[PDB]
Amino acid sequence: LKRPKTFFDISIRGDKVGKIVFELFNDIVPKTAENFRALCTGEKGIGKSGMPLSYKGTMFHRIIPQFMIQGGDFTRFNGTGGESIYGMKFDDENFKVKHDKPGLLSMANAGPNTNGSQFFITTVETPWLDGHHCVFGQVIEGMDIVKQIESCGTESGRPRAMCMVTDCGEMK
Template sequence: MKKKTKEFRPCKIPRYLVGSVSPHVLKTDLAEYNAHRYKIFTAKTKTDTKPPKMNPFNYVNVRKLRADAERLRIIDKENKQILKAINTVNRTIGRVDSYNPQAYACKSKWNAHVLTMKKIEHKNRAIYHKIMAASSSYDCETLRNSWLGIIKKLKMSSKFPLVILQKTSADVTFSKEPSISGGLEKFSERPICFLEFQVVDGVNLGRMEIELYHDHVPVTVQNFLSICCGDNKKKLTYKKCPIHRIVPGRFLETGDITKGTGKGGTSIYGKHFAEEGHKLKHAKAGVLSMVRVHKHNNNSRFCITFANMESLDKQNVVFGHIIRGIDNLFKIEGYGRRIGKPLAPIIISKCGKLNSVPES
């Protein structure tokens, strides 16, 4: 039977959507597409049936073939010997007639091993007797009596409290430091307020009593004292205000009663008020001064120095200094870091005004 030849059937459906191109483009594209299909349909394959030229000796190593044949011959011979031995075992039902003289050779070394162990035991016993016969060069009884005496003294001294006499407080020491007023005349009695600091949900850091120089910077002192007491129309207060910056060896900053970050603050006079004079100096530790806001303005933010800070004399307006509780200031300094952010959150737990007059 003759094979049926396939007929070429041109495609009648255009490849473009109807209406997307003009009829002329539609017809031309369909004709080119059918011509391409016809070329593929009528293409004939070309096959090269000639064998490649090759030399079998280039692919076959005669020396290796001979070596393999010799090895196969030897293996075949060994297999015949194994089969012969297996046949012998089967016929004699596994008879054993061999003896290995090396099988029990280790028993001949046991006596030598026992003798060696006895020598080691003899040496160990000699070392043991030497250790037991040794005596200490120290007088044990004297050491024991000395230790008992020390224990008796410790028990006796523990009955009495250790009192350090003539201890000078830090407040007295810092009161002898140079005055922040530099010898300026005292025009009136100066009010005294207090600030108590505490670690949030933690230890109480103590109270600091502050003398305010109302006779030299009345506007600044009135703003600070009013916020400290909380007796202003806006109900502003320093209570629960955080310390947002502590720089060891320099100062701490607080008083931001609006944001608590050092970027806020306000005053009883408005958002801020103008600076007063710079007569008072940062002459020692424990000096309070306002933190400058914008250009020559202040609000509620202030700082307390940990040392003499002459570099702040022309920047911050000084309005007071600590007269009691300077030790507590240095406790707060211990929470400081070089970057300024405290190691733990610290707030002003209590604040207000005192009626007592500072000691001379």
């Protein structure tokens, strides 16, 4: 099977800056790749939170230069929420893929088997994250836009400008 491809449309400080396109490692982590894929299309509908299972209109709420950019919180928009297509949380699937390069897409979590909808995109190699966060895809287009989002962050993770996924979906 092909690796699924998805996209974020991105605006920064209210300005359209282009598209990020991901490819998802459904050959390595099919449950984790599927969660992100279906959250890009919104096809599952309304979650246990009462809000759409969709990344549309979410923010990169935690941005740390020379580390990663993190988003996916579509229930509280601030990093305190989110929900997967499997429930509030789902298990770590495997750790086959290493955080050994920029542009990797990986699951944010609060410890083992606590994946939800939050994800991060690395901007450096992050080997200390290996074995703790499931890497499930990578940026194939728009790494510069990832850098433009990164440039709005701080050491504490607080954004200095609103970077938004204005639309998203699957490329098929």
